[PDB]
Amino acid sequence: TPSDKPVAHVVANPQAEGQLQWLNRRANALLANGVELRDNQLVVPSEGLYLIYSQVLFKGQGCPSTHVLLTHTISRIVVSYQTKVNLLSAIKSPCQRETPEGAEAKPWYEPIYLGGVFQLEKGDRLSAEINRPDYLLFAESGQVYFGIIAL
Amino acid sequence: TPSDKPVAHVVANPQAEGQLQWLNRRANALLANGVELRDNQLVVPSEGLYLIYSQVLFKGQGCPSTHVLLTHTISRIVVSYQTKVNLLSAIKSPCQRETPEGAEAKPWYEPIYLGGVFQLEKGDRLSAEINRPDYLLFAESGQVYFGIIAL
Amino acid sequence: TPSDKPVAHVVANPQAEGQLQWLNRRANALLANGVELRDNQLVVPSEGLYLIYSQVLFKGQGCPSTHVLLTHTISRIVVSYQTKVNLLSAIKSPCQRETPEGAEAKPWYEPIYLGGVFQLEKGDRLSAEINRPDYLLFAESGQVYFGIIAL
Amino acid sequence: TPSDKPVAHVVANPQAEGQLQWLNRRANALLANGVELRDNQLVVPSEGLYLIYSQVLFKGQGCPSTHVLLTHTISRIVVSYQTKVNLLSAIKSPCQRETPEGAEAKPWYEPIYLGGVFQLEKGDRLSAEINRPDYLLFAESGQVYFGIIAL
Amino acid sequence: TPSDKPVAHVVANPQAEGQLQWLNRRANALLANGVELRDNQLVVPSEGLYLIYSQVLFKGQGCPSTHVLLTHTISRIVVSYQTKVNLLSAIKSPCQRETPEGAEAKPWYEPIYLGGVFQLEKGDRLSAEINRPDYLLFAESGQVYFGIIAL
Amino acid sequence: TPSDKPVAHVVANPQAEGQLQWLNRRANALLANGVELRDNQLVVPSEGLYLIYSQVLFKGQGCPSTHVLLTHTISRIVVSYQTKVNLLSAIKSPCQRETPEGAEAKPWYEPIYLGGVFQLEKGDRLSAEINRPDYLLFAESGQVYFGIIAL
């Protein structure tokens, strides 16, 4: 705040190497006039038409022996009705099988974006889930973030 | 819905063989005040500030031939000047041949997300299209979006 | 209707070699309410909350020698700290082997879209920095864009 | 009208990217007597037998990787027994190898016309669709059409 | 109350191996007002002007040698000259050259639409026949069949 | 004879190697009850819905050195729009890179079937043509023909 819009900006925390934890107070972010964070998800007050958006960048270390599959989704947790309801998702499986025999792993980089304004409710907790946590680039700021904005 | 704000969230019609038919009355279909779902393209209600966003999950179960070129374009054909002047565009390229005979299925997923703000006046057509709908993922509901929101 | 809000939306100059010369004074491209385009940097007039966005579609006819690497870094320069603070950071790597010996050069395509909302102060300047302005595609409308809007 | 029997002749919108669209107001495009196309489907508004016919012509220039299988599948999704029962269907094979290379690509003009008598009901939706939209001869009106006549 | 105008439209036996038995009923298969299927023929009720349509689809893996060249006819065996006159017939060759030993290959597809309007009498046997009954396709709804309609 | 119907069904003139003449007074020449035939044109009386149709079987023992490109167009001249206008056209590509070397020129067969109803009127002349008669096949049961019907 300034501007009266419950808005969030939750930059991924770079501490626990292998999971992903959303964090506030990481330089510049937002968790004001309504918007709060609890357990790996942002709880939406009142209700409304909120713009959702989460970024995740998959830092590579070569080409593991298989088609790993990458999956970036943003789930919704409703108050009345609950559990795992898919509001929006995406996928992109890394490297096409090279098995590093030659010039092994000069990194690979696959960033994914998700966005859309949706109809939410009071206490509606939205969360950005990942399939393979073991690949996120931590030489960031903007490489991994998650935010919601009031409209 | 809150206010008189022209919102419109549409997905792709699974039952529209080799054609990206934009559909409502789904999982989070928003039809606001003056939002008109015509022949795929969107009609602007009032005027001014409009946010246009769209994701396209170009999925593939193996990589075929040459240079892929899966594009995703958003153009506006207005009143006054009745012709389609582009807004947004994007082309992603999965296939870097690989096509080995002896493997064949190289499950590629190369999504194309877009988002920008435009002028859009009263009585416009918002054309959200792609060049190869055969490679359309209809697995998740957060598969494809078309969206408008006046500010 | 125009809203009482600062919003910028520039398209990279169709005619300008090797530079991201954001261009205004275009048809469906916007540059309004206080926010202008100064030093080839998007400068803001107010404060509070702002929606920052930009995508830079790349192309290189052929997959050359070693990791070319690509990065899209949206930074904020303030009238007080006067240092660059990276807000939207991301990396793209389009060829993990290719060297098309007997086929001249297969022209890969790779779009990088960075977008999030931030808390910015008065008089701050915005820049959609790019390391390799060698591979951008100008035969667009929206292949390379930049936009802001306070909310 | 002359005749008051339901006659609908809808020709393909030549500016619909990667999708076969049907419109009227063209050449000899008569969507008369109760027959209306709501969403790229022809809705028979009465009981009775009708002559259903439609043709599609495929462009293509330079035969690719084997079997694209152009499919012109004329169908009916009846409102009573809510299932999309194909009435017509057509699978065609474009080339016997070629894979241009040396004598680099020439067109392979292919006509696909279907027609037959079918007894229908009120509100019955008629489907045209083609799986290969990226191969249409949208230079000439009269070689891409849909039409039904009552008897 | 559909119509009281003699009409027939028999599809081929979905379970009859390498032949061409004609079945009324089946899918959206028609036969009404005198029109009847005898010894696999469209025998005429009463005299008049009738529309005659018979389309077939041929399926075959690899395009051999020889030059089998699939053909399809419609003959009018009646009462006077009840010896069969070539009502309507044509020829199409799927094979110029292949003999696919370099794999075993992939198939070929070839549809053949026959149609016209004739002056037939009471009790006329109209016979639609394919010289090579092996090459067909029951992987349809409406690929292979016969049909007539009164005036 | 029966039911006053603007009908016509005509075959070719086999007695002219280089031509395109439709001969009335053949096996089944249904040019009666009102229709006319003059300068290779089916003369349209009354006015009304006329389902037109024509098919041509092109034959050739191997292909000459180049892209021959066979066609087939159904055209009309109306008292109002006094000019040869395109109603129904179709193109077919028969040879690629066959132009023999090995063995003698192997026969390709290309049937061209088209049809579709339009609004025809009194004084309308309809022309049934092709590109080059040099590939027209004699054995015309239903090899080469043209016909009209009305409703």
Question: What is the per-residue burial (b if ≥16 Cβ within 10 Å, else e) of C59-75?
Answer: bbeebeeebbebbbbbb
Residue pair E49/E119 in contact by the 8 Å Cβ criterion: yes
**CA A51 to the chain's CA centroid:** 14
Q: Please state, as a whole number, how many other Cβ atoms lie within 10 Å of the Cβ of residue C142.
A: 23
CA distance E36 to chain D (A): 16
- Contact call for residues E123 and D25 (beta carbons, < 8 A): no
Cβ–Cβ of A96/B108 closer than 8 Å?
A: yes
The length of chain B is 151
CB A123 within 8 A of CB A46: no
In angstroms, the CA A32 to CA A24 distance is: 11
Give the bridge partners for E22, in sequence order: E12
The encoded tokens of residue E53 equal: 């349509």
- Tell me whether residues A5 and C151 touch, CB distance under 8 A: yes
- D67 to D144, F8, F9: CA distances (angstroms): 22, 40, 38
Residues in D touching F118 (Cβ below 8 Å): 9, 28, 30
Backbone angles phi, psi at F102, to 5 degrees: -55, -85
What does chain F come to in residues?
151
Q: What is the DSSP letter of B134?
A: G
Q: Are C55 and C111 in contact (CB under 8 A)?
A: yes
Chain B residues near residue C28 by CB distance under 8 angstroms: 76, 85-87, 118-119
Evaluate whether B110 touches A56 at the Cβ level (below 8 Å).
Answer: no
C-beta of residue C5 within 8 angstroms of C-beta of residue C149? yes
Residue type, C1: T
Question: How far is the C-alpha of C69 from the C-alpha of B94, rounded, in Å?
Answer: 17
Q: Check residue E142 and give left, alpha or beta (phi > 0: left; psi -120 to 50: alpha).
A: beta
Spatial CA neighbour of D148 closest among D130, D122, D126, D129: D126
Method by which this entry was solved:
X-ray
Nearest to C45 by CA among C115, C126, C109, C99: C126
Please enumerate residues of D whose Cβ is less than 8 A from a Cβ of B.
Answer: 15-21, 39-40, 64-65, 71, 73, 77, 84, 127, 129-134
Which residue's entry shows tokens 């602007």? B44
Beta partners for residue F29, in sequence order = none
Q: Please, is B112 exposed, middle or buried when counting C-beta atoms within 10 Å of its C-beta (0-12, 13-18, 19+)?
A: buried
* Helix/strand/coil for E83: coil
* Residue numbers in B near A93 (CB within 8 A): 107-109
Resolution of the experimental structure, in angstroms:
3.1
Tokens of B93: 């390229």
What is the Cα–Cα distance from F68 to F110, expressed in whole angstroms? 12
Q: For residue F93, which residues of chain D lie inside 8 Å, CB to CB?
A: 106-110
Instruction: Tell me the two tokens of residue F7.
Output: 């009908």
F31 Cβ contact list (under 8 Å, min separation 6)? F7, F8, F9, F10, F24, F37, F42
Is D132 exposed, middle or buried (CB count within 10 Å of its CB: 0-12, 13-18, 19+)? Answer: buried
Contact list, A114 vs chain B (CB under 8 Å): 55, 113, 142
Q: How far apart are CA C59 and CA C140, in angstroms?
A: 13
Touching status, chains D and F (3+ beta-carbon pairs under 8 Å): yes
**Which long-range contacts (C-beta less than 8 Å, at least 24 apart) are formed by D22-27?**
D22/D128, D22/D146, D26/D141, D27/D141, D27/D142
Neighbours of C150 (CB within 10 A): 24
Query: What domains can you pick out in chain B, each with its CATH number?
Result: 1-151 (2.60.120.40)
SS3 content of chain A, % helix, strand, coil (to 5): 0, 45, 55
Give the one of F89, F113, F151 whose C-beta lies nearest to D143's C-beta.
F89
Give CA–CA dist A55/A77, Å, rounded. Answer: 19
Q: Which pair of structure tokens corresponds to residue D7?
A: 């006659």
F69's CB contacts (< 8 A; 6+ apart) are D109, F91, F92, F93, F94, F131
Q: Which residue has the tokens 């950071």?
A: C89
Cα-to-chain-centroid distance, residue D1:
23
- C-alpha dihedral, B148 to B150 to C2 to C8, nearest 10°: -60
Radius of gyration of chain D measured on its C-alpha atoms: 17
Exposure on the CB side of residue F64, measured as CA atoms within 13 A: 9
**Residue in the block written with tokens 């055969």:** B134
How far apart CA E90 and CA E113 sit, in angstroms, is 9
SS3 C102: helix
CB atoms near residue B83 (< 10 Å): 9
Report residue D46 as tokens: 């009465």
Question: Is B87 close to C28, i.e. CB distance below 8 A?
Answer: yes
Task: Report d(CA C22, CA A49) in Å as an integer.
Answer: 31
C96-103 LR contacts (CB < 8 Å, sep 24+): C96/A63, C96/A95, C96/A96, C96/A98, C96/A108, C96/B96, C97/A98, C97/A102, C97/A103, C97/B96, C97/C63, C98/B96, C98/C62, C98/C63, C98/C64, C99/C63, C99/C64, C99/C65, C100/C62, C100/C63
Could you tell me the CA-to-CA distances from F126 to C117, D51, D139 in Å, in that order? 65, 22, 22
Question: Taking the alpha carbons of D128, D129, D132, D135 in that order, is the dihedral positive or negative?
Answer: positive
Supply the DSSP string of B70-126, one letter for each residue.
Answer: EEEEEEEE-SSS-SEEEEEEEEE--------SSS----EE--EEEEEEE---SS-EE
Q: How many CA atoms lie within 13 A of A17 on its CB side?
A: 3
Q: Which residues contact A125 (CB under 8 A, 6 or more apart)?
A: A38, A41, A42, A43, A44, A76, A77
What strands, in cross-sheet order, belong to the sheet with E107-120? Answer: E30-32, E7-9, E147-149, E48-61, E107-120
Q: What are phi and psi of E127, to 5 degrees?
A: -115, 120
Position of tokens 């037109």? F52
Residue in D96, D110, D120 to test binding to E, most E beta-carbons within 10 Å? D96
Taking the CA atoms of residue A40, residue A46, residue A51 and residue A54 in that order, the dihedral angle to the nearest 10 degrees is: 0
Size of interface B-C (CB pairs under 8 A): 85
CA-CA-CA-CA torsion for A76, A82, A83, A84, nearest 10 degrees?
-40
Under an 8 A CB cutoff, do C88 and A142 touch?
A: yes
Q: Are D75 and E141 a contacting pair at CB < 8 A? A: yes
Q: What distance in Å separates the CA atoms of residue A146 and residue B142, rounded to the nearest whole number? A: 17
D28·F118 Cβ contact <8 A: yes
| Amino acid symbol at E62 | G
**Rg, Å, chain E Cα set:** 17
- Using an 8 Å CB-CB cutoff, list chain E residues near F1: 119
Q: Which two tokens stand for residue B107?
A: 């499950």
Locate C74 and state its tokens: 């949206």
Residue F69 in contact with residue F118, Cβ under 8 Å?
no
